Design a protein around this ligand. Structure first.
Ligand SMILES: CN[C@@H]1CCc2c(ccc(O)c2O)[C@H]1O
Lengths: 52, 282, 331, 235
């Protein structure tokens, strides 16, 4: 019971964490680089749209 | 004439109100998928009938009253009369059908789902419209309703006056089919519904020891009765006894029956869903 | 006793997470241009379910999607042509999840009945019936044609081998029932959000919860990875949607508006990851901007409560299946 | 080419016809949920009318379908929000479990469960049919002086039997007071929260009773009648 929880927290303790600035910058870079190929973000042309 | 312009203004307001209300009803039903319901198909049928009435017979009738003459052709006089009869009969029969639907929904809740379907509702609406159209167009278009006395003959031959003269037989038949049979059916339906509501309220009081039906039924029945019954009574009388009733009173009661159409959608569309749909529309 | 040690380790984890933080995503993001207003309309409105809808899953292609309802029929639709390719009657009257295999050959459904039935589209019959769960299976997803991961009413999440029909491994460590699950672009990692505020990342091969995120104040109804796979977003009965980052191991942002108090049933991301789309108990969907956290659009077409929300792999369209038995395709 | 489109349209038409038949079958059937305490006596009443237990019993040519989600010892009920189209929720409570306290009384926990069901944001239009099991055993307990409700329930000390209460053809005043006190304890929770959309129907049932099917049929009929009346603003 409690031993399993203690072991799980001990295992979760030793995890390397990168600074939030770097992670935010990586998410920013992905969103900026892959923004061109997004029909939702940029209104797709009517001819290009399969639905309409 | 100040008297004439006032009548023109009041009829213009009446036709505008009828058209606006009914168009709003059809638009609200058609726009939203939540509103489309088996009973709402009958509501749409009633709204369409009243809208056709307001578009066709109210403006032409007002023009006939104000100008005191019929500028258009005799065939258009007959067509206008047929359209008016069709609209009135369809509207009243649709009210009767709505009452019957409520009766079958309350009295037999278990079998109500199977009793009424979309296809069956469409069949019922088509049958109502077919019988109304027959009763209106066929006797009028085939000239069975035309009277025999010289007073009607001169009016029918003349191309300037569009007045209604009818036999003692067609008047009775049309009045019966349009109003009296629907009146009896609706009275019996709403008596049964009131008894069921009273029984349910009595049971609820028997339990949970720690009115509303009367007001709603009073609206639904009394408005329709006070709007249509006098006109049909004088419709029967004018062939039963010609001398008593006057033409002006006859037309006045007919116009009360007309404004019944504009009163209908304020009564039959007070549900909160219809209110939300109306708010979204406007 | 052991509770003191557990509290000490939890405090150490909290201190490490706090020291790891440098600045919020808003601090970096506020400089860039906003997404602007986003307008979407119901390109296709798909009809044919008797009862209210809970779950849909887009196929590998953007063409096909599968939906289920309590009327007992699992219907596969062709989104482009608005045609019903298949309709599968379901043994269980109540179903709460759907799954469309990456190959498209198989489709699996769960339900209140504690059985994960898998149907072979290309033969529709019950290929395998998966049993061994105490509680209702809330969500099911496909690692491949042979492997399926199911979150169930009991705290355990399980990985199954379809051919063998037995649980290859079971994931334990949650307090409440597991409601939502999402797979990474690579099939190695997956998370599961449960009734408890905690949402845990799992490792399929190891079978252990590497990280646990507990930012929420209530049950988590929806969870979904970022397309990169480094982040995921969680819905809740609270009006907040939160974006969690695996490397940072803590919450990055919360998506909430003062006016809305309804919970979030389903969440999803756009292909680029800029737009977070979240369903709501308020009969409408909201399209947040992930970086800005400022709402960019609203989808109020549905009449009843939305229950599912998926975005095509191509990124062409978004489909929301609500409780009015009506599933609508937005673009 | 167009042949594939024509074949797909034909398949769509066949599926639509099958769905229409399924809708015709589905509309007739009325769905019920039988929620109750584990020790209340659900099994006996289920056998009386007859992970999830589904039974199909028909009365007066009306198809009733009943589901009973038992087991797993669930305390936070999330499946309860799925049962939104059910006409009625059958609640089975043992009114004779007042003295038996499972570490709070079982009847008190049943009252809490009924309150949770009643005050649910999703079951705001679902009526509850309440069955109070083991009236004979309740009578056996109340006739004996070992356990009295006043000791366990403090409101019973000042409580009195309702004037309009209808006693059984053969029943003691004390058991009548006890059963009516329990029924009013449930009905006090039932009445306050509701706005008139849904009601509670309390029925006093023994294990030997076999007329429960008719009682459920009548309760469902009343529920649908009241729903239709309120829809038309008549009630
Ligand atoms: C222009 N006057 C018409 C002619 C007779 C008639 C009317 C309405 C309903 C009927 O059933 C009728 O037979 C009147 O509106």
């Amino acid at each position: 019971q409690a031993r399993k929880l203690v072991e799980q927290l001990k295992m979760e303790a030793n995890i390397d964490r990168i600074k939030v600035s770097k992670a935010a910058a990586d998410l920013m870079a992905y969103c900026e680089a892959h923004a061109k190929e997004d029909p939702l973000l940029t209104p797709v042309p009517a001819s290009e749209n399969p639905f309409r | 004439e100040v008297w004439v312009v006032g009548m023109g203004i009041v009829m213009s307001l009446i036709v505008l109100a009828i058209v606006f209300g009914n168009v709003l009803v059809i638009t609200a039903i058609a726009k939203f998928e939540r509103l489309q319901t088996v009973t709402n198909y009958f509501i749409t049928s009633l709204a369409c009938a009243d809208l056709v009435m307001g578009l066709a017979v109210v403006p032409f009738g007002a023009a006939h009253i104000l100008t005191k003459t019929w500028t258009f052709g005799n065939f258009w006089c007959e067509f206008w009369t047929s359209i008016d009869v069709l609209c009135v009969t369809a509207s009243i029969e649709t009210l009767c059908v709505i009452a019957v639907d409520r009766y079958f929904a309350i009295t037999s809740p278990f079998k109500y789902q199977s009793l009424l379907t979309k296809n069956k509702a469409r069949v019922i609406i088509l049958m109502v419209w077919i019988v109304s159209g027959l009763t209106s167009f066929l006797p009028i278009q085939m000239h069975w309703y035309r009277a025999t006395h010289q007073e009607a003959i001169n009016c029918y031959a003349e191309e300037t006056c569009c007045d209604f003269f009818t036999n003692q037989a067609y008047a009775i038949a049309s009045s019966i089919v349009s109003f009296y049979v629907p009146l009896v059916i609706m009275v019996f339906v709403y008596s049964r519904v009131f008894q069921e509501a009273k029984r349910q309220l009595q049971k609820i009081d028997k339990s949970e020891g720690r009115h509303k039906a009367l007001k709603t039924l009073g609206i639904i029945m009394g408005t329709f009765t006070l709007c249509w019954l006098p006109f049909f009574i004088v419709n029967i009388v004018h062939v039963i006894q010609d001398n008593l009733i006057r033409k002006e009173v006859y037309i006045l009661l007919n116009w009360i029956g007309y404004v019944n159409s504009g009163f209908n959608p304020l009564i039959y569309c007070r549900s909160p869903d219809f209110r939300i749909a109306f708010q979204e529309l406007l | 006793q052991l509770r003191q040690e557990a509290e000490q380790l939890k405090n150490q984890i909290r201190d490490a997470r706090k020291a790891c933080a440098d600045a919020t995503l808003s601090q970096i993001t506020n400089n860039i241009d906003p997404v602007g207003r986003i307008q979407m309309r119901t390109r296709r409105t798909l009809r044919g379910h008797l009862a209210k809808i809970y779950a849909m899953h887009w196929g590998t292609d953007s063409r096909l999607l599968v939906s289920a309802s309590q009327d007992g029929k699992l219907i596969i639709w062709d989104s482009y042509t608005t045609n019903k390719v298949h309709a599968i009657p379901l043994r269980s009257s109540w179903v709460m999840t759907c799954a469309y295999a990456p190959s498209g050959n198989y489709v699996a459904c769960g339900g209140l009945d504690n059985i994960c039935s898998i149907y072979n589209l290309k033969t529709v019959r019950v290929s395998r019936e998966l049993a061994g769960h105490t509680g209702y299976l809330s969500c099911c997803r496909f690692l491949d044609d042979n492997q399926i991961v199911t979150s169930s009413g009991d705290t355990t999440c399980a990985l199954w081998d379809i051919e063998t029909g037995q649980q290859t491994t079971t994931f334990t460590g949650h307090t409440g029932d597991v409601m939502s699950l999402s797979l990474a672009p690579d099939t190695r990692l997956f998370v599961s959000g449960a009734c408890d505020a905690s949402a845990k990342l799992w490792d399929v091969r190891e079978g252990m919860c590497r990280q646990t995120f507990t930012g929420h104040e209530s049950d988590i109804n929806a969870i979904c990875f970022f397309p990169n796979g480094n982040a995921f977003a969680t819905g809740s009965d609270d009006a907040t949607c939160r974006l969690f980052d695996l490397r940072a191991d803590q919450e990055l942002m919360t998506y909430s508006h003062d006016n809305i108090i309804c919970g979030i049933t389903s969440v999803s991301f756009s292909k680029s990851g800029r737009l977070l789309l979240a369903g709501y108990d308020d009969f409408n969907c909201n399209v947040w901007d992930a970086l800005k956290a400022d709402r960019a659009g609203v989808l109020a077409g549905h009449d009843n409560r939305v229950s599912c929300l998926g975005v095509t792999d191509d990124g062409m369209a978004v489909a929301t299946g609500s409780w009015d038995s009506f599933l609508k395709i937005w673009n | 080419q167009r042949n594939e489109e024509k074949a797909q349209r034909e398949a769509n038409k066949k599926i639509e016809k099958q769905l229409q038949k399924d809708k015709q079958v589905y509309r007739a059937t009325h769905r019920l949920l039988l929620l109750g305490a584990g020790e209340s006596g659900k099994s006996t009443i289920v056998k009386q009318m007859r992970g999830i237990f589904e039974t199909k019993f028909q009365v007066d040519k009306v198809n009733f379908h009943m589901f009973d989600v038992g087991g797993q010892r669930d305390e936070r009920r999330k499946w309860i929000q799925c049962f939104n189209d059910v006409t009625a929720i059958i609640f089975v409570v043992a009114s004779s479990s007042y003295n038996m306290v499972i570490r709070t009384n079982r009847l008190q926990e049943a009252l809490n469960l009924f309150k949770s069901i009643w005050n649910n944001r999703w079951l705001r239009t679902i009526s509850v049919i309440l069955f109070l099991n083991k009236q004979d055993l309740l009578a056996e307990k109340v006739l004996a002086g070992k356990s009295k409700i006043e000791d366990y329930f403090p409101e019973f000390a000042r409580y009195t039997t309702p004037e309009d209460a209808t006693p059984e053809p053969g029943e003691d005043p004390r058991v009548t007071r006890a059963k009516y006190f329990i029924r009013d304890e449930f009905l006090r929770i039932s009445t306050a929260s509701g706005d008139g959309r849904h009601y509670c129907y309390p029925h006093f049932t023994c294990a030997v009773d076999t007329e429960n099917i008719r009682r459920v049929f009548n309760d469902c009929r009343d529920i649908i009648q009241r729903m239709h009346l309120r829809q038309y603003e008549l009630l």
